[model samples]
Target: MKIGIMSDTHDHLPNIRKAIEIFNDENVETVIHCGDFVSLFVIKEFENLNANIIATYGNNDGERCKLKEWLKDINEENIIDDFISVEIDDLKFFITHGHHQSVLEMAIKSGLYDVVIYGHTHERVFEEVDDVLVINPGECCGYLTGIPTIGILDTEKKEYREIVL
Candidate 1:
């Protein structure tokens, strides 16, 4: 399955929309956002996505209550915590915002997940730890760095690529 991964949106609706369109064009059925959505308004943009989106909480997401309220009907699952563990297509994934370096490192060193997706540094990172694939989609909002990017993962192939928007 082709999955779309993004993070650090920080309320950039245009980029988010473009990313979703790209994901749809690629026929991605699942989307995972590492976090830093920022506000509730930005969270609404996920409704434009055609896939199931799972998002974790970032340091910038302050309106937790409002975000949850808005997400009730969006089909996107807003994980109120900093991290999430999910299995898709026989592949295990650990998703986080990457604010806590220790936790991120632990997840990578634990060797329990097939993939680890995270954001927060606003720098793209794509590499492997032992057999685990680690990905950081950068800043989708382009707030920190000038480049706005996202990640595309093919679960069947265990391969991923970074896309700049």
Candidate 2:
């Protein structure tokens, strides 16, 4: 399976739309967001994607009730207050927003997952530690670092690549 990963989409609809277009063009099967969606309305930007979408709450996503209300009918699952464990094509994945560096570090050190997806540093990272793939899709909004990026993971090949938006 091929998956699209992104994070820190701080309400930048244009960038998000571009990312979605790219992901769709690549025939991505699933899209995982590390968080920092900012507002509930911003979640709607992903409605056009044909793939399954999942997200984790970020430090900036303060409107919990509103966010939940927005997602109530969307069918997409959003992990609030921390991380989530998901399996795709028999591969284990741990997803988080990475606001707390310690949590991200612990997840990396545990060596319990095939892939660890995180964000919040607004930097792109695609490296392996202890045979575990650790990926940070960077700042999709280009808020912290002027460069927006995302990642694509090919589970069948056990490989991944980062794309600059």
Candidate 3:
């Protein structure tokens, strides 16, 4: 199972398309967005993806309830949570938006997850802490950081890569 990861897309249409193109090319089974979608329109574009999406909202997002409703509809309730926990093969992931430091810390330190993915800082990060893989896919919009990025996890291999889109 391959998972696609992204975050902080504050409504850059072209970049979002590029991200989708990449994900499709890579043939990921699932996609995760550590969101800063801002509103429903930004998320509407994600409908093109061939993979299943599991996502979390950020400080910039204004339509939380609508986003949740939309996401539930999109995933067809495969499994849902804003700060969700998912397992792919032997690796488990805790996905969040990174505004709540306590939750992020707990997910990483509790030894309950093999990967922790969060985004809000618009910074690209991938590190291992206490046997946990932590990742931030940076800003997909290239608005804050000026470097468009995304992430990919190869669940079968238990490895990840950050892609500069």
Candidate 4:
């Protein structure tokens, strides 16, 4: 399975649309987001991308109830709230927005998953820990890091590649 990862959009629709175009061009099956979308309408923007999405909350999304109402339009399974553990082929994967905790470090220390995906610091980071992959897709809107980037995870091969856009 090929997965596209992104984070910290901060309600920048233009950048998100650009990233979606890129991800769509690549035919990514899943689009994982790590948070900081000020409005839930940003999530609806993915509807046209033709991909399944999994996401978590960031410190910036203060209106949880409103977010839920926004998510109700989509299937519940496709819109995850907190942390998520998913299995693709033989790999165990974890996904979170990373504002509340360090998912990568914990996954590395636990030695339980093939990869852990997160974003909070708005910086791109990809590293291997005891055969596990920890990836932060960076801030697609560049709220902190001036350069915006996204990532691709190849589940069959167990590898991640960062794509700067």
Candidate 5:
């Protein structure tokens, strides 16, 4: 399966728009946002794309209560809080926002997932630990670090790739 990965949007509309276009054009099967969406509107935009979204709230995610409203009508089972664990084709991913806690550190300690995805530093990283792949999709907003960035993971191949818009 091909999935899109993004993090630290920080409420930048233009960058977010670019990402939406890319995902739609690419025909990605899933969209995973590690955190820092900054507003609920971003969540709605993703839903509008007709893509399945799995996200975690970040450190700068100021309005948690208001944002949680988006999960209301949707299937709460898919929306993970603090962490999300799922297995697809024997590739299990444990995902989190990566702010208050390092999901990677926890993954290393437990050594329980095929991949660990988190975002907070907004810098791209792809590494492996005891056979587990760790990834940070970076900042898509172009706010503090690099240019508009995103990641793609091909579960069938067990590889990750990045896209800069």
Candidate 6:
């Protein structure tokens, strides 16, 4: 499966739109968000997407209940607390906002997940630790790192490429 990976949007509509465009243009099947979408309003921007989304909440999203409510309109079972997991093809994947460093690190070190997706430091990462494919798609908001980026994951091939915007 071809997947789209992103994080730390912090509610920047344009960048969010741009990322959506890239994903749709590439015909990504699943879009995974690591977190930090500051406000609930940004959820509406995601309505334009052509693919399914799996997202997690970040520390900045104080109104968790409200955000969850807003997300129901997007995808009823998509949003998660600190992290979430799923199985794609024969591979196991873990998705986290990366706020809980210990859990994130543990997940990375653990052999349970074939791929671990996270975003927290506003820096892009794509590394292979043991047999795990670990990725951090950077700041989609462009407010923090000033260099917005997103990632594309080819699950069948177990490889990824970061696209800077």
Question: How much lDDT does each candidate structure score?
Answer: 0.82, 0.80, 0.81, 0.77, 0.77, 0.82
For candidate 1, write residues 1-165 as lDDT tens digits.
899988888888899899989998997978888778887887677777788777788887898777767765786454445678989889889998878778878898998998888776455788998888889988887877788888898999888888989
State every prediction's TM-score relative to the real structure.
0.93, 0.90, 0.91, 0.88, 0.88, 0.92
Candidate 1 vs candidate 5, TM-score winner? 1
TM-score preference between candidates 2 and 5, better one: 2
Q: What is the C-alpha RMSD of each candidate to the true structure, in Å?
A: 1.6, 1.8, 1.7, 2.0, 2.1, 1.5
Worst 10 residues of 2 by lDDT: 72-81
Question: How far does residue 146 in candidate 6 sit from its true spot (Å)?
Answer: 1.3
Error of 3 at 122 (Å): 3.5
Of candidate 6, the 10-residue stretch with the lowest lDDT total is 74-83
lDDT tens readout by residue for model 4, 25-130: 8858888886777687887887677777777777788787777666656655567676778876677878788764554578667878888887765546788768
Model 4 TM-score on a 0 to 1 scale:
0.88
Off by over 4 Å in 3: 78-80
Model 4, residue pairs in steric clash: none
Clashes of 5: 0
Return model 2's CA RMSD, one decimal. Answer: 1.8
Candidate 2: tens digits of C-alpha lDDT, residues 49-132: 777776778887889777666654565454344678888899888998877778777887887788888777455788988888
Q: lDDT of candidate 5 vs native?
A: 0.77
Better of 1 and 4 by TM-score: 1
lDDT of 3 at 5: 89
Give the lowest summed-lDDT range of ten residues in model 3: 72-81
Off by over 4 Å in 5: 71-78, 100-103
